[PDB]
Design a protein around this nucleic acid. Structure first.
Ligand SMILES: [Zn+2]
Lengths: 328, 110, 92, 111, 70
RNA sequence: GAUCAAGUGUAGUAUCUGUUCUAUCAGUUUAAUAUCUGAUA
């Protein structure tokens, strides 16, 4: 092992394909950002003087310089719902930080992607999905943002472009056909880059619950629901629609997913399991959704899910929770 | 006492209060928790109660040899050379009285 | 008629349907069939309401209409509104 | 020391600190905590309710680090890729919680 | 059958929403306490010590769904 | 389908023959009925 320090709990990273640098998102609950950590320190020094006053001034000056490392003494625990988060560009050969964007207090990065957009061609972009004022338990949130940066200097610096608001946490981001697919809560949306903000080309509201992950292959999109496992979606390119065409027959608390082939998904869950789910032969992805309402009224899916079902072809309890799957 | 049997939603009221009015049956209104019941009836992989539960008659009071068998070695090969899976019903397809009458190579094949 | 059909089979009981012009069908698991019958289907047509499973077991006009309001709002909401696609400077 | 799932004091004068997450530590106990530059608090001292004893956190005084069991718990994210132009792909592993987080590069081999 | 009553968290035809959910929540918290990896997940997600996560779960065992219906 | 009487047999479960079911309301009860208990003819 060679180990390179990070500042908060890393949630995800992506390899920028040309210069091979890692874009890492780090995020903690009960945490202060460095700006807030400094401001907290400043007020506590002033409060210590305004509690003798010559010695208090010395102790306050001492305290402002007293700067014990978080790695040894612990990061100071902010209250419930308080978040600190950073986006780090890092070289994988030796872990020098090339760039470090710091997000606002109580912004929590949950998703990241590196991509090109069709409109801008060669230009690279980092999209980072952020929750604002997320409370975990009981769950509530002040919506979210997607931050866009233009990757520049051979993928060594994040040039901030714009910050686009969204209604709920953008929990997954996936580049799709020169556009970006972002899962905001239970809504799956296709976003064009735009100039001042991302533009919502398409949206699907039929996902049962919160979206944890998004994989893609061709026109197929595999959506990981937080509890209702795998949903297969097709993007109808000409018709501008995201259509659900298949689902699993079990609840799974999916943590991560991997595509094995065009028809097959390996998944893992919060309960230490792995599964492989496959679409049965002659599953049809060329499916409609009705412009009047018929396919949500008369015509319908099976068991209160989609009309076609995936087969579970593998199940195994690993004995311990899996957060990464990769075919390699 | 009959009073609590009057202290119930109407079918109209239960139909409008819920995300899925198409799962609301006449009887559902009479439950101890009609809102939990209708919720459970709407869950994504859940199986309906056998429809005969309210019938006055008992459940069923209203073979061909599989082709590979029917087709020493032959009898082994019926099981280990040419045995086809029968038509299998999917999860939740309960039996009832009237039921009958980019590359695409698979990963991890052999 | 063997009168255990009236009592035991439940053909004593009766229900009206306003959608069926106030017509009546006697016993419960017989009555339940009119939601797929021409009196009912014509009543639903006369109110501009499709006779979906959502309206099975609904016998009253104001209910069928108000449920058809709530369902029409729901089924308008549930889908993609391409009038609410976004275009650059922003326009929908 | 890092927050521990378990501590064992060995008869031979070592403290083993099974870290809650990340690497585990063996420390030699250099001193038994019988200094007096730093005060000893007591249940017999007068104090109020809501009031509290206060102490100063400071670097390792009674403990000396002697071994570190390099530990991947928790692995939060992973990519297997060659990013070094070696023969063999490395595993890029996002590890740890909080300020003991790390990105670790794993190669098949011996240091 | 009668002997099922030896086992807490079983139900019967007059089991309410509240009784059933309180058993689901109590069984869930006991499962989280036993499964070391499931406990890891919550400690990392909350940025909280495994010992405080366990304590918070034990505190939640008393009244996991709020008070009985009425 | 419920319900009363009688024969017969088994470790236990029952079978089998001969009857009753004709009007509304209230209470009990049921998923809804029904049965049952009162009332009005
Ligand atoms: Zn009708």
């Amino acid at each position: 092992q060679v180990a390179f320090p990070l500042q908060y709990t890393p949630r995800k990273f992506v390899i920028h394909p040309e210069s091979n640098n890692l874009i890492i998102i780090e995020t903690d609950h009960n945490a202060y950002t460095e700006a807030t950590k400094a401001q907290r320190k400043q007020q506590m020094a002033e409060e210590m003087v305004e509690a003798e006053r010559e010695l208090a001034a010395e102790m306050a000056a001492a305290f402002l310089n007293e700067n014990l490392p978080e790695s040894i003494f612990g990061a100071p625990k902010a209250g419930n719902g308080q978040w600190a988060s950073v986006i780090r560009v890092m070289n994988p050969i030796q872990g020098n930080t090339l760039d470090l964007v710091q997000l606002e207090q109580n912004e929590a990065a949950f998703s990241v992607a590196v991509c090109r957009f069709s409109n801008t061609g060669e230009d690279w972009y980092v999209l980072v999905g952020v929750a604002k004022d997320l409370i975990l338990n009981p769950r509530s949130v002040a919506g979210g943002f997607v931050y866009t940066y233009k990757l520049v200097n051979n993928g060594e610096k994040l040039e901030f472009l714009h910050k686009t608001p969204v209604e709920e946490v953008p929990a997954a981001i996936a580049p799709f056909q020169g556009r970006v697919l972002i899962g905001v809560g239970k809504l799956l949306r296709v976003y064009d880059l735009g100039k001042k903000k991302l533009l919502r080309k398409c949206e699907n509201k039929h996902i049962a619950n919160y979206i944890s992950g998004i994989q893609t292959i061709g026109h197929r999109v595999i959506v990981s629901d937080v509890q209702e496992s795998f949903i297969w979606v097709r993007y109808k390119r000409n018709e501008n629609q995201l259509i659900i065409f298949a689902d699993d027959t079990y609840p799974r608390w999916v943590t991560t997913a991997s595509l094995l082939d065009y028809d097959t998904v390996a998944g893992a869950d919060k309960f230490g399991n792995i599964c492989v789910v496959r679409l049965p032969p002659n599953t049809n992805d060329e499916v409609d959704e009705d412009p009047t309402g018929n396919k949500a009224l008369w015509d319908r899916g099976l068991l209160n899910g989609a009309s076609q079902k995936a087969e579970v072809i593998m199940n195994y309890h690993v004995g311990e929770t899996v957060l990464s799957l990769q075919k390699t | 006492k009959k009073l609590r049997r009057m202290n119930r939603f109407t079918v109209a009221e239960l139909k409008q209060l819920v995300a899925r009015p198409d799962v609301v049956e006449m009887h559902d209104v009479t439950a101890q928790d009609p809102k939990l019941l209708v919720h459970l009836k709407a869950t994504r992989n859940s199986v309906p109660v056998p429809r005969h539960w309210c019938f006055k008659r008992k459940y069923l009071q209203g073979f061909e040899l599989p082709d590979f068998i029917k087709r020493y070695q032959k009898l082994h090969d019926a099981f280990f050379k040419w045995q086809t899976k029968p038509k299998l019903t999917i999860h939740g397809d309960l039996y009832y009285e009237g039921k009958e009458f980019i590359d695409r190579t698979p990963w991890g094949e052999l | 008629i063997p009168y255990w059909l009236y009592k035991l089979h439940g053909l004593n009981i009766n229900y009206n349907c306003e959608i069926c012009g106030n017509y009546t069908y006697r016993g419960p698991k017989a009555f339940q069939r009119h939601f797929a019958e021409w009196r009912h289907a014509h009543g639903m047509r006369c109110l501009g309401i499709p006779n979906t499973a959502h309206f099975a077991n609904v016998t009253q006009i104001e209910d069928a209409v108000s449920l058809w309001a709530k369902l029409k709002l729901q089924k308008a909401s549930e889908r993609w509104q391409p009038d609410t696609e976004e275009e650059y400077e922003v326009v929908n | 020391v890092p927050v521990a799932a378990a501590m064992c004091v060995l008869k031979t004068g070592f403290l083993f600190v099974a870290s809650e997450f990340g690497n585990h530590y063996l420390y030699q106990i250099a001193h038994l905590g019988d200094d007096d530059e730093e005060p000893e608090f007591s249940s017999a001292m007068p104090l109020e309710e809501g009031d509290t004893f206060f102490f100063q956190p400071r670097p390792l005084k009674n403990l000396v680090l002697v071994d570190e069991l390099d530990s991947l718990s928790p692995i939060l994210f992973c990519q297997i890729a060659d990013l070094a132009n070696e023969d063999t792909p490395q595993l890029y592993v996002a590890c740890g919680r909080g300020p003991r987080s790390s990105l670790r590069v794993l190669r098949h081999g011996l240091e | 059958e009668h002997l099922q009553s030896k086992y807490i968290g079983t139900g019967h035809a007059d089991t309410t929403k509240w009784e059933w959910l309180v058993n689901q929540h109590r069984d869930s918290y006991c499962s989280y306490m036993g499964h070391f990896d499931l406990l890891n997940y919550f400690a990392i997600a909350e940025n909280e010590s495994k010992a405080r996560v366990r304590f918070n779960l034990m505190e939640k065992m008393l009244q996991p769904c709020g008070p009985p219906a009425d």
